[PDB]
Design an enzyme around this catalytic site. Structure first.
Site, PDB file in Angstrom:
ATOM      1  N   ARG A  54       0.868  -1.180   0.000  1.00 23.31           N
ATOM      2  CA  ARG A  54       0.000   0.000   0.000  1.00 23.31           C
ATOM      3  C   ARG A  54       0.899   1.222   0.000  1.00 23.31           C
ATOM      4  O   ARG A  54       1.631   1.473   0.964  1.00 23.31           O
ATOM      5  CB  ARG A  54      -0.926   0.035   1.242  1.00 23.31           C
ATOM      6  CG  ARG A  54      -1.977   1.150   1.239  1.00 23.31           C
ATOM      7  CD  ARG A  54      -2.972   1.036   2.443  1.00 23.31           C
ATOM      8  NE  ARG A  54      -3.762  -0.186   2.299  1.00 23.31           N
ATOM      9  CZ  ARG A  54      -3.820  -1.143   3.209  1.00 23.31           C
ATOM     10  NH1 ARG A  54      -3.180  -0.997   4.368  1.00 23.31           N
ATOM     11  NH2 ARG A  54      -4.541  -2.240   2.973  1.00 23.31           N
ATOM     12  N   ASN A 101      -1.130  -1.717  12.304  1.00 22.76           N
ATOM     13  CA  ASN A 101      -1.849  -2.603  13.217  1.00 22.76           C
ATOM     14  C   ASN A 101      -3.335  -2.602  12.893  1.00 22.76           C
ATOM     15  O   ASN A 101      -3.816  -1.882  12.025  1.00 22.76           O
ATOM     16  CB  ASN A 101      -1.613  -2.198  14.694  1.00 22.76           C
ATOM     17  CG  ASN A 101      -2.173  -0.830  15.041  1.00 22.76           C
ATOM     18  OD1 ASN A 101      -3.352  -0.546  14.789  1.00 22.76           O
ATOM     19  ND2 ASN A 101      -1.358   0.014  15.671  1.00 22.76           N
ATOM     20  N   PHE A 112       5.025   0.988   8.418  1.00 24.43           N
ATOM     21  CA  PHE A 112       4.887   1.991   7.366  1.00 24.43           C
ATOM     22  C   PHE A 112       5.910   3.094   7.567  1.00 24.43           C
ATOM     23  O   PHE A 112       6.402   3.359   8.670  1.00 24.43           O
ATOM     24  CB  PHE A 112       3.448   2.584   7.312  1.00 24.43           C
ATOM     25  CG  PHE A 112       2.973   3.267   8.558  1.00 24.43           C
ATOM     26  CD1 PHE A 112       2.503   2.521   9.617  1.00 24.43           C
ATOM     27  CD2 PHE A 112       2.947   4.677   8.669  1.00 24.43           C
ATOM     28  CE1 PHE A 112       2.020   3.147  10.783  1.00 24.43           C
ATOM     29  CE2 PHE A 112       2.453   5.295   9.788  1.00 24.43           C
ATOM     30  CZ  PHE A 112       1.971   4.511  10.851  1.00 24.43           C
TER      31      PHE A 112
HETATM   32  C1  LIG Z   1      -6.181  -5.607   4.611  1.00 27.04           C
HETATM   33  O1  LIG Z   1      -6.348  -5.429   6.009  1.00 27.04           O
HETATM   34  C2  LIG Z   1      -7.477  -4.683   6.510  1.00 27.04           C
HETATM   35  C3  LIG Z   1      -7.257  -3.168   6.308  1.00 27.04           C
HETATM   36  C4  LIG Z   1      -8.250  -2.647   5.306  1.00 27.04           C
HETATM   37  C5  LIG Z   1      -7.834  -1.443   4.513  1.00 27.04           C
HETATM   38  C6  LIG Z   1      -7.247  -0.343   4.977  1.00 27.04           C
HETATM   39  C7  LIG Z   1      -6.952   0.821   4.107  1.00 27.04           C
HETATM   40  C8  LIG Z   1      -7.147   0.850   2.734  1.00 27.04           C
HETATM   41  C9  LIG Z   1      -6.792   1.987   2.014  1.00 27.04           C
HETATM   42  C10 LIG Z   1      -6.231   3.131   2.586  1.00 27.04           C
HETATM   43  C11 LIG Z   1      -6.027   3.073   3.985  1.00 27.04           C
HETATM   44  C12 LIG Z   1      -6.362   1.923   4.682  1.00 27.04           C
HETATM   45  C13 LIG Z   1      -5.421   4.260   4.693  1.00 27.04           C
HETATM   46  O2  LIG Z   1      -4.799   3.960   5.972  1.00 27.04           O
HETATM   47  C14 LIG Z   1      -3.580   3.420   5.811  1.00 27.04           C
HETATM   48  O3  LIG Z   1      -3.109   3.255   4.736  1.00 27.04           O
HETATM   49  C15 LIG Z   1      -2.980   3.120   7.159  1.00 27.04           C
HETATM   50  C16 LIG Z   1      -1.721   3.962   7.350  1.00 27.04           C
HETATM   51  C17 LIG Z   1      -0.966   3.451   8.606  1.00 27.04           C
HETATM   52  C18 LIG Z   1      -0.652   1.937   8.484  1.00 27.04           C
HETATM   53  N1  LIG Z   1      -1.937   1.288   8.289  1.00 27.04           N
HETATM   54  N2  LIG Z   1      -2.654   1.691   7.127  1.00 27.04           N
HETATM   55  C19 LIG Z   1      -2.472   0.361   9.124  1.00 27.04           C
HETATM   56  O4  LIG Z   1      -1.837   0.025  10.137  1.00 27.04           O
HETATM   57  C20 LIG Z   1      -3.878  -0.173   8.824  1.00 27.04           C
HETATM   58  C21 LIG Z   1      -4.849   0.730   9.604  1.00 27.04           C
HETATM   59  C22 LIG Z   1      -6.311   0.607   9.173  1.00 27.04           C
HETATM   60  C23 LIG Z   1      -7.071  -0.547   9.478  1.00 27.04           C
HETATM   61  C24 LIG Z   1      -8.421  -0.605   9.101  1.00 27.04           C
HETATM   62  C25 LIG Z   1      -9.015   0.408   8.382  1.00 27.04           C
HETATM   63  C26 LIG Z   1      -8.263   1.551   8.122  1.00 27.04           C
HETATM   64  O5  LIG Z   1      -8.865   2.578   7.439  1.00 27.04           O
HETATM   65  C27 LIG Z   1      -6.915   1.666   8.481  1.00 27.04           C
HETATM   66  N3  LIG Z   1      -4.005  -1.539   9.268  1.00 27.04           N
HETATM   67  C28 LIG Z   1      -3.749  -2.531   8.393  1.00 27.04           C
HETATM   68  O6  LIG Z   1      -3.399  -2.385   7.210  1.00 27.04           O
HETATM   69  C29 LIG Z   1      -4.015  -3.958   8.949  1.00 27.04           C
HETATM   70  C30 LIG Z   1      -2.784  -4.858   8.869  1.00 27.04           C
HETATM   71  C31 LIG Z   1      -1.613  -4.215   9.631  1.00 27.04           C
HETATM   72  C32 LIG Z   1      -3.031  -6.265   9.428  1.00 27.04           C
HETATM   73  N4  LIG Z   1      -5.171  -4.537   8.241  1.00 27.04           N
HETATM   74  C33 LIG Z   1      -6.439  -4.369   8.819  1.00 27.04           C
HETATM   75  O7  LIG Z   1      -6.613  -3.746   9.854  1.00 27.04           O
HETATM   76  C34 LIG Z   1      -7.618  -4.953   8.019  1.00 27.04           C
HETATM   77  C35 LIG Z   1      -7.728  -6.440   8.365  1.00 27.04           C
END
Ligand SMILES: CO[C@@H]1CC/C=C/c2cccc(c2)COC(=O)[C@@H]2CCCN(N2)C(=O)[C@H](Cc2cccc(O)c2)NC(=O)[C@H](C(C)C)NC(=O)[C@@H]1C
EC number: 5.2.1.8
Length: 163
Positions: A54, A101, A112
């Site tokens: 991402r 997380n 990230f």
């Molecule tokens: C696929 O997994 C799912 C996530 C779904 C999609 C999230 C999504 C999509 C597009 C743009 C953005 C987020 C913008 O925010 C980021 O980019 C943030 C930036 C900080 C790091 N980050 N993503 C994370 O740490 C994100 C934070 C998050 C979770 C849920 C929704 C959301 O909006 C943001 N967490 C995750 O990616 C975790 C993973 C570490 C196991 N996954 C999960 O919680 C779910 C099981």
């Protein structure tokens, strides 16, 4: 005493450049050690060969899923997940390295790299390091990102380790 680790980044298998990080073991030693050991591969798993799944230009680059390779996986060196160590450090600007997380106390391997100050993540994501060298490589990586984060080329950690 703070360790430094590196990622050699590739774009569709061609070398792009090396990003090096200082890990703030002085303030978040458990979190720094996880990232350090995953970078060397010394537990038999880790970041080598994994991708940045991402990338959102002007926000951050996220990676570290070496178990499922679909954004949902990865694990720590402590079993599966581990607790938020502390929130002493903040998301103050470009280059900050922080744990991804799925809510409180769910740190695994995903991380990230911020390309801007992201203070709304303060107290929610554990900050544990900063880019030391190769911010121009992170800026080049952004060119392969998009608004929703899907990458337009495969952005991989071709090699990684400790300096
Ligand atoms: C696929 O997994 C799912 C996530 C779904 C999609 C999230 C999504 C999509 C597009 C743009 C953005 C987020 C913008 O925010 C980021 O980019 C943030 C930036 C900080 C790091 N980050 N993503 C994370 O740490 C994100 C934070 C998050 C979770 C849920 C929704 C959301 O909006 C943001 N967490 C995750 O990616 C975790 C993973 C570490 C196991 N996954 C999960 O919680 C779910 C099981």
């Amino acid at each position: 005493v703070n360790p430094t680790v590196f990622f050699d980044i590739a774009v569709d298998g061609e070398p792009l450049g090396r990003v090096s990080f200082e890990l703030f073991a002085d303030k978040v030693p458990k979190t720094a050690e996880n990232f350090r050991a995953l970078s060397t591969g010394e537990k038999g798993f880790g970041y080598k060969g994994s991708c940045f799944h991402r990338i959102i230009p002007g926000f951050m680059c996220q990676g570290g899923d070496f178990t499922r390779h679909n954004g949902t996986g990865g694990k720590s060196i402590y079993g599966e997940k581990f607790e938020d160590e502390n929130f002493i450090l903040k998301h103050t600007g470009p280059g900050i390295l922080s744990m991804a997380n799925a809510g409180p106390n769910t740190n695994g391997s995903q991380f990230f790299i911020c390309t801007a100050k992201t203070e709304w993540l303060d107290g929610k994501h554990v900050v544990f390091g900063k880019v030391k060298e190769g911010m121009n490589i992170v800026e080049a990586m952004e060119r392969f990102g998009s608004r929703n984060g899907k990458t337009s080329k495969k952005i991989t950690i071709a090699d990684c380790g400790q300096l």
